[PDB]
């Protein structure tokens, strides 16, 4: 079928410690090869491949354009940060935690947001990091995450296995137990 030609433009606002440190990266990508970019830390455009060389010097020569890109950190990045803060930064969705079965215990933690989370296993109140395996942090694409954290065990009659989940949506940790 026909050859394709692709043009991409990305403006990335990186925020550190709330809105204290802000870095703006304007990237231009032809097909899959970034060609020129504006890094707020640099203060002016720079070509990343010979193809962007013409664009970096033509743009760097327009004072008002650069004044604008430099101030973008505030008018653009900081501004948009405050615009969605209530439903992005502050978004909190509690994970649904389930626990179920030489054995392999499974701690299912799903439907939570943000992606930041801690899932620890416990054998009779004693932590066990060994033999622990996981799917890693899965991003569902709908503003929720999931993850399975398994523990390889030799369940003796009586032992109590607990899965503890620490996540910002809940003040005190979430725990679900399993009795062998």
């Amino acid at each position: 079928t026909r050859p394709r030609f692709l043009w991409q433009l990305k403006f990335e606002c990186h925020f550190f410690n709330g809105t204290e440190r802000v870095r703006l990266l304007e990237r231009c990508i032809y097909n899959q090869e970034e060609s020129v970019r504006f890094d707020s830390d640099v203060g002016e455009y720079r070509a990343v491949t010979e193809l962007g060389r013409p664009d970096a010097e033509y743009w760097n020569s327009q004072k008002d354009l650069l004044e604008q890109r430099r101030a973008a950190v505030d008018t653009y990045c900081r501004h948009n940060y405050g615009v969605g803060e209530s439903f992005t930064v502050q978004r909190r969705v509690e994970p649904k935690v389930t626990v179920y079965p030489h054995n392999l215990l499974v701690c299912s933690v799903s439907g939570f947001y943000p992606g930041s989370i801690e899932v620890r296993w416990f054998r009779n109140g004693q932590e066990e990091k060994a033999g622990v395996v996981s799917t890693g942090l899965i991003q569902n694409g709908d503003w929720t995450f999931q993850t399975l954290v398994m523990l390889e065990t030799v369940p003796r009659s009586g032992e109590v296995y607990t899965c503890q989940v620490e996540h910002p949506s809940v003040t005190s940790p979430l725990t679900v137990e399993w009795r062998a």
Binding site: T19, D64, E67, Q68, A71, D74, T75, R78, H79
Partner: protein, 212 residues
């Protein structure tokens, strides 16, 4: 609920145009004369050899700058300006900063602009003062809006506007561009007598919202 341009009188609309398109700007001058405890007198240093009377809100302020080299930036006027002597006295509220407190390098403040939701071109303003009065900043943004959007022309399509001055810290100052407090600068400009001053580097940006 912003005030409407149609609530102002042709005079107010005229005095609004005049002061924002023609602010009084003098660089570095001294005054060793308070007047009424709340003003500083700069003799013959106003427009056309006139004596200049910078009015402040509290005596503390006039005091603060007395006998110091200061920079002046702000709306000026004559009507209702208390006379000091034989010569004509030109008035101005606040708009006073210390001449010696200049930034390392010039500061550029960006301003987002929307008209009924439609994003327009971004505007820029600059200052090299380490500390600038909200007045200097407001005036500079209104000049652009005046030229670009005809905000103070009686028959322009814009009828409502709001200017927001965002600080890097969660602070924010704002003005309803049609919420003048009278039709004479003597009244209108009393909003600046507090001589509110911001640290230029602490400023983030400006957001402008206009409505037809």
């Amino acid at each position: 609920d912003l005030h409407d341009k149609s609530e102002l009188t042709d005079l107010a609309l005229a005095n609004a145009y005049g002061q924002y398109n023609h602010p009084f700007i003098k660089e570095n001058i001294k005054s060793d004369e308070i007047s009424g405890e709340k003003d500083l007198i700069f003799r013959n240093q106003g427009d056309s050899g006139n004596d200049l009377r910078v009015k402040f809100a509290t005596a503390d302020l006039a005091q603060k700058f007395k006998n110091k080299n200061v920079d002046i930036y702000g709306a000026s006027f004559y009507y209702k300006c208390e006379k000091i002597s034989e010569n004509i006295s030109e008035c101005l509220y606040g708009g006073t900063t210390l001449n010696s407190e200049k930034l390392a390098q010039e500061r550029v403040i960006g301003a987002n602009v929307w008209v009924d939701g439609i994003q327009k071109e971004t505007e820029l303003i600059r200052t090299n003062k380490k500390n600038v009065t909200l007045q200097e900043l407001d005036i500079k943004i209104r000049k652009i809006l005046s030229d670009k959007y005809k905000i103070y022309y009686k028959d322009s399509e814009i009828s409502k506007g709001l200017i927001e001055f965002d600080m890097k810290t969660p602070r924010d100052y704002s003005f309803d561009i049609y919420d003048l407090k009278g039709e004479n600068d003597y009244e209108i400009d009393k909003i600046y007598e507090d001589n509110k001053t911001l640290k230029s580097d602490d400023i983030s940006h400006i957001d402008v919202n206009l409505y037809t």
